[PDB]
């Protein structure tokens, strides 16, 4: 809307920074349980509702 | 055996009683099949000029008697099908009638 408040823009910026798949080097540890991050979200499917 | 034998084609023979929406595609299919039957090959290519000529009158108004020529060409290397290859090419005439198939010598 190009009129968001600063806190709204900050929330969206944090969401954008969060939006990434898993780094590859994580799987190279010992006794690992992380397979694929379930917190990944895309605009098409899920809506954060601010 | 590279040969060139200018034939004649009438659309009315094979476009009679067909859907108005697909007159030109039907003409294209009939032209390629006619070339196939009158040559005896596997690969047939049309000419952009012939496409222009057939579509030019209209999508549902293709002219009946159109003059075309067929050229045999030897296929390039690494062609697993055959050296056989046919290429079509249009040519305009003053009158549709009065012409028949004529072989033209290579020059």
């Amino acid at each position: 809307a190009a009129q968001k408040s600063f806190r709204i823009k900050q929330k969206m910026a944090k969401a954008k920074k969060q939006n990434r798949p898993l780094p590859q080097w994580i799987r190279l540890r010992t006794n690992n349980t992380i397979r694929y991050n379930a917190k990944r979200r895309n605009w098409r499917r899920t809506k954060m509702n601010i | 055996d590279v040969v060139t034998r200018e034939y004649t084609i009438n659309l009315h023979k094979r476009l009679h009683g067909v859907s108005f929406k697909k007159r030109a595609p039907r003409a294209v299919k009939e032209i390629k099949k006619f070339a196939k039957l009158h040559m005896g090959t596997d690969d047939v290519r049309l000419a952009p000029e012939l496409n222009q000529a057939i579509w030019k009158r209209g999508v549902k108004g293709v002219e009946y008697r159109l003059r075309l020529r067929i050229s045999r060409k030897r296929n390039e290397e690494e062609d697993a099908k055959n050296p056989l290859f046919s290429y079509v090419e249009p040519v305009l005439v003053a009158s549709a009638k009065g012409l028949q198939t004529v072989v033209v010598e290579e020059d």
Binding site: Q24, W25, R27, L28, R41, R45, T46 | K56, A94, S95
Partner: protein, 149 residues
Amino acid sequence: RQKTMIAEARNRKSLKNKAIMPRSKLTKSFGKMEEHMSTLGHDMSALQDKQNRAARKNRYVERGSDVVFGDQDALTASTENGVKLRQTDRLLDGVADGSMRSKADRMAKMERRERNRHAKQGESDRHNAVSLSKHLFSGKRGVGKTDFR
């Protein structure tokens, strides 16, 4: 002749629909123009005389410098990178060894298999499904206000 010419012009015009390329800015070839000049039957003597004029770029094809770098060999090695430019890659730079890089790629390829079986749009799509519908498994369709059309 006039009937043939008018037929050819009608075929070639096509002015109605889109456009006509300007003859002043189109490009041609003297190889093509030779047939037309012969058909007009003019003096070819003062026409082919311009062919030798093109003897300027004929020697320019040679440049030297390893005979233009000795074929295309650096491209094959330079195109092996997953991404170009000089920026930090949070996936490539995470693992240094190529063997471990291949191992990580294999791990990712294997891991995506379960989501592929589940037919999810990707690692991010998680749209669940409801077991039953309140508006499709209740009510009595008596006379009057129907449940739905």
